[model samples]
Target: DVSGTVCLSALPPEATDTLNLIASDGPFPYSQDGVVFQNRESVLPTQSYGFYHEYTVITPGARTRGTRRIITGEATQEDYYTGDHYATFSLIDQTC
Candidate 1:
């Protein structure tokens, strides 16, 4: 089950930056950022096509965009994080 939860502080600061970006409606770093996630992993409860959008979690010093991500659910403003390139996910928890 994708029932795990991650403390917001547990994630890198960039994830917070991404969250703020999502909150403010961003000029994202990646063209694919804020694009549909598709959720083909079926980890999230199935939703309409536009319900989920993704943002990149910057990995410092990485040559690439890296595997980490934040997936936002528009329907209820839920947020999820994946460090494993969508192989798994954990809810992003604000309460420490």
Candidate 2:
């Protein structure tokens, strides 16, 4: 197992639309550690600059004694990345 943080940034359209941002802590069922997905949309222009949100914590059910974690934020409308598969954002971190 691993542990680390993920930060994402992008430029949104001048118009307006929902921006979806997702960060997952995972590997999934068989592996003990399950994946968690979170998304936030429509971060406002009126909102604060660097208007970013994040989640941080230790992962559970991980094969290794160590735990995994991540932080993802949506800066715009067109930024995307696939989820981690049995992999970790942070592979070596504080562990049990």
Candidate 3:
């Protein structure tokens, strides 16, 4: 399991850093109707840490979609943070 802290803020002075996330195993299974996601949590701390959700749609009429759902199970710090986090992400094809 991966455990770490998270924080969300829109203003400089309203900033925070006190929420945490624990994931038992990654590539958390998801489906829009029933299409599967083949992904990996290859990096820890995630370039930016904490829970997240990702969605994908395959091209060329495959109509396939992928989702990376990060389940936030526990929190070690809660005083300085809220419950939502947002960040930038990049995607690449990894099928062989």
Candidate 4:
């Protein structure tokens, strides 16, 4: 049971699509996809407002924006995933 990290390729398949959109600077499906994630919940590493940006990880059948998201840290191009919204976070590791 890993507590704080995940392998990038192991994430939901749609997550790769979201990363592609971010790489292309998006035509994001959700209006709030690129918005700065204000760390109001303080679950992520403490950083200034703009450091963390969020993008939605599409849920195939959800009518509204799903809770799963990809949170990025600009300083190191690090990625974090949260399936239960921001209540928990798992850093995406490249050393798979």
Candidate 5:
């Protein structure tokens, strides 16, 4: 239940980049990108398998892909972002 909206222009540069990549049907930076999100914690709204997918968000100094991410729903066309792995999320609002 993290309830709030984050504008596309207000996100981190890397996040914005990932969003654009998603729009373009990307050359994603990680093998894990575009994989189905299980939503084991149930932080997100319930949905059937394959309804949700994830993408990486670059962390400036982390050697790996870091804990940040973008989760998008196929049916909703809405996006969510987790800055601390999957522990918390914020809805991404492209409209403003």
Candidate 6:
């Protein structure tokens, strides 16, 4: 089961923007933004293939997309944010 939750407004502006984009069916910034998340690290709860998808969370002043990411599930509204490139994740509490 997922533990803890993060307020949407508490997250980085870029992350919030990315989440909005995902919700709106974005013209995503990165080609790989919406790709299927492999979940190779097994940090998340077990789910079938294609259950999860990933998007970039731009790091301020960074040339690349950085290690930050917002990973969402097939459930659409359910999502997680990771600042450590999937090493850790915080469940997004969008209701806030």
What residue runs in model 4 are displaced by over 4 Å at the alpha carbon? none
The per-residue C-alpha lDDT of model 4 at residue 19 equals 82
Output the lDDT of residue 19, model 2: 21
| lDDT ranking, high to low | 5, 1, 6, 4, 2, 3
Which residue pairs in candidate 6 have backbone atoms (N, alpha carbon, C) closer than 3 angstroms, thus clashing? none
lDDT at 50 for candidate 3? 30
Lowest summed-lDDT stretch of 10 residues in model 3?
A: 14-23
Query: Please, what are the lDDT tens digits per residue for candidate 4 over residues 1-96?
Result: 225788878989888888889889999999999999987888887888799999999999998888899988896658888888788888887566
Q: After best superposition, candidate 2 residue 57: deviation in angstroms?
A: 6.5
RMSD of each: 1.2, 14.7, 14.0, 2.2, 1.2, 1.4
- The segments of candidate 3 whose C-alpha lies over 4 angstroms from its true place after superposition are 1-30, 33-40, 44-50, 66-96
lDDT, each prediction: 0.88, 0.28, 0.25, 0.85, 0.89, 0.87
* C-alpha TM-score for every candidate: 0.91, 0.19, 0.21, 0.90, 0.92, 0.92
| Global lDDT of model 3 | 0.25
Clashes of each: 0, 5, 0, 0, 0, 0
Q: Summarize candidate 5's per-residue lDDT along 3-83 as a digit string, tens digits.
A: 577887788889889989999999998999999999988999998988989999999988898999999998555899898
Candidate 3 lDDT over 16-59, as tens digits, reads: 11111112222322243122222244432333233332322222
TM-score for predicted model 5 compared with the true structure: 0.92
lDDT of 1 by residue, 19-54 (tens): 898888898888889999899878898998888999
Give every collision pair in model 1.
none
Compared to the true structure, candidate 3 yields what TM-score? 0.21
Better of 2 and 6 by lDDT: 6
User: For model 6, what is the error of residue 6's alpha carbon versus the real structure, in angstroms, after optimal superposition?
Assistant: 0.6
lDDT of 6 by residue, 26-95 (tens): 9899898999998887888888989999999989889888999998988757799999878889999888
